[PDB]
Amino acid sequence: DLLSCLTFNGVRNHTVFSADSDSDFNRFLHLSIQNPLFQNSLISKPSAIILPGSKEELSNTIRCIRKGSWTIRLRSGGHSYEGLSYTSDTPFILIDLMNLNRVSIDLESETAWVESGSTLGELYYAITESSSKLGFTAGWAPTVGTGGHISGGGFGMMSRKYGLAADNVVDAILIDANGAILDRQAMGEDVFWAIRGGGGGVWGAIYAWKIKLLPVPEKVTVFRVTKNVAIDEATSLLHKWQFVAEELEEDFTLSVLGGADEKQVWLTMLGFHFGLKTVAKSTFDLLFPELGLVEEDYLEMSWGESFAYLAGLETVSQLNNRFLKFDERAFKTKVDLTKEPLPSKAFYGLLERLSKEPNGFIALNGFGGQMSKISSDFTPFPHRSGTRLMVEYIVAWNQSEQKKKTEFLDWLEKVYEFMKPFVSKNPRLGYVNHIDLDLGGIDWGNKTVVNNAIEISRSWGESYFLSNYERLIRAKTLIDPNNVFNHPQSIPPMA
Ligand SMILES: *Cc1cc2c(cc1C)nc1c(=O)[nH]c(=O)nc-1n2C[C@H](O)[C@H](O)[C@H](O)COP(=O)(O)OP(=O)(O)OC[C@H]1O[C@@H](n2cnc3c(N)ncnc32)[C@H](O)[C@@H]1O
Ligand SMILES: *[C@@H]1O[C@H](CO)[C@@H](O[C@@H]2O[C@H](CO)[C@@H](O[C@@H]3O[C@H](CO)[C@@H](O)[C@H](O)[C@@H]3O)[C@H](O)[C@H]2NC(C)=O)[C@H](O)[C@H]1NC(C)=O
Ligand SMILES: *[C@@H]1O[C@H](CO)[C@@H](O)[C@H](O)[C@H]1NC(C)=O
Ligand SMILES: [Mg+2]
User: 152 CB under 6 A from ligand 1?
Assistant: First the structure.
């Protein structure tokens, strides 16, 4: 029936479920699974996979699915930390957007239309090919899809200068529950607000984003330096780092990745400056001489080169390869936002815990700069002025380490518990692109839960969106009153 409808409407790229492990179905399913944690045979699988190739095909795909009784799942880059783009407890149809990866750069307006299947890497590659003086602000990972990422905000190394990806969206095409093809004018300002950070898989299917391209100098300066130190020094480095980071002028970003193994602590310092190396080095010589950076650590390169470099890629060319796997390990990650400085003992304790679990690591970023100049309700992402740091805790493992899974997750749980007193409180804040089901989830098939959906959903909803939660609910009710686009943590519509 679904297939007949798709045919009648001219949608031809579809594949039904097959048990054959070598089937084209399985191949398409796995192409964009970015967390092996959700890859096994015991996980839910779609009844069919549809690959629309145009806005009309996307519209008609949604229309056909509604004539049946399916749960819609949209996938762009497949990076959902919780696999929410390709799993569902109820029978589902996977709409994979990988064929919608056209990027159209307009150098006369310095804007771009970006189909929502395009990855960050594909976008960055297109921009750098078009111009040496234009860039865009989004996350570091080149295989992340614009569909999920911009829908959830999109934070990266240029956010202190330019804010989130979603803060630089000026139009969009949204395909609603009825297949309507809506631009900014058609969807209205409440819905255009909601899609710019309110979370993917909730409002409809974004067909394309229109973004404003942003100035970058022809040469920027970066460094990636790993310090191999002991815990005393690592603690004092991290404790000073937090002040250096949040306070730097907007033309600088300094972030950290960290881990340990018994007495050996490693801290990888990632630096970016919107300018030349003489200024970059004079700034860090003055503000953070403890890092011990030398002249040869500072590299001058193009903006596109810098994004490939910070992502750990070999070349700018690799940005354009969406199936170059970032990593092959299963993972679980959690995040905190902070409002007060972290005491030294928090870093010491975090490092002690890392030293006992070499499969764990942390990633630390400062806000400030432009992030403090954007109002909390400009877009749905509310963590602006007053927000000091974002702290990510990750544990990752390979197949050979599978039996330690329970232990790894316990370690992460304990780290998050340890950090509780030092980070944001009442409520403990989160970030929707860092979706975390530990916070809870709605079973939309459970009537008693659905009756109280708004209160229940406030647990994660206010963590992600704070006061913006109320406006999100109104926008949801407007654009998807029948809740066609839903998942365990989707914004509830009013009854
Ligand atoms: C995997 C990963 C993620 C990541 C990261 C590094 C890696 C290796 N670094 C990040 C960073 O530097 N800054 C940042 O803000 N986020 C970072 N992340 C997390 C990443 O942003 C999120 O995982 C993001 O949501 C992933 O987007 P992607 O498009 O790749 O993922 P998805 O699983 O397919 O979709 C996620 C949700 O959005 C819905 N979706 C997908 N496409 C659409 C469209 N077109 N319209 C509406 N909703 C859409 C999915 O259904 C799912 O709910
Ligand atoms: C539905 O969409 C999928 C995914 O786009 C289509 O498969 C893709 O088809 C293209 C074009 O045939 C393939 O590119 C080709 O790759 C070969 C090497 O195998 C290369 O020599 C050619 O230059 C060509 O570019 C691509 O590999 C393939 N992608 C995947 C993941 O399979 C598929 O054809 C579509 N199905 C239908 C019925 O339209
Ligand atoms: C609905 O959810 C509640 C609370 O999560 C649970 O106790 C109950 O068993 C569920 N009811 C049904 C009918 O599934
Ligand atoms: Mg076979």
Answer: yes
Do 152 and 164 form a contact (C-beta atoms < 8 A)? no
Experimental method: X-ray
Helix, strand, coil percentages (3-state) for the chain, rounded to 5, are 40, 20, 40
Beta-strand relationship, 111-115 and 103-106:
antiparallel
Q: Which two tokens stand for residue 431?
A: 């970030």
Ligand 2 site residues, Cβ closer than 6 angstroms: 12-13, 31, 51, 99
Verify whether ligand 1 is closer than 6 Å to residue 121 (CB atom): no
Write the single-letter amino acid at 318: Q
Q: Which value in Å is the resolution of this experimental model?
A: 1.5
CA–CA distance, 99 with 102 (Å, rounded to integer): 8
* R_g over Cα of the chain: 22
Q: How far is the CA of 99 from the centre of ligand 2 (A)?
A: 10
What is the H or E stretch that residue 335 is in?
A: strand 330-337
Asked if residues 43 and 83 have their Cβ atoms less than 8 Å apart, the reply is: yes
**Preceding-residue numbers of gaps in the chain (C–N over 2.5 Å):** none
Closest CA to 123 of 310, 311, 301, 319: 319
Among left, alpha and beta (phi > 0; psi -120 to 50; other), residue 456 is alpha
Q: Give the ligand 3 atom nearest the CA of 445.
A: 14
Q: Phi and psi at residue 391, in whole multiples of 5°?
A: -125, 115
Q: Quick one: tokens of 7? A: 């045919």
- Which residue has 């771009």 as its token pair? 112
Residue 209: closest CA among 157, 137, 130, 140 = 137
Write down all domains in the chain, each with its CATH number in brackets.
1-100 (3.30.43.10), 101-218+302-325+427-495 (3.30.465.10), 219-301+326-426 (3.40.462.20)
448 lines ligand 3 (CB under 6 A): yes
- The number of angstroms, rounded, from the C-alpha of 116 to the middle of its chain's C-alpha atoms is 14
Q: Is the CB of 155 inside a 6 Å radius of any atom of ligand 1?
A: yes
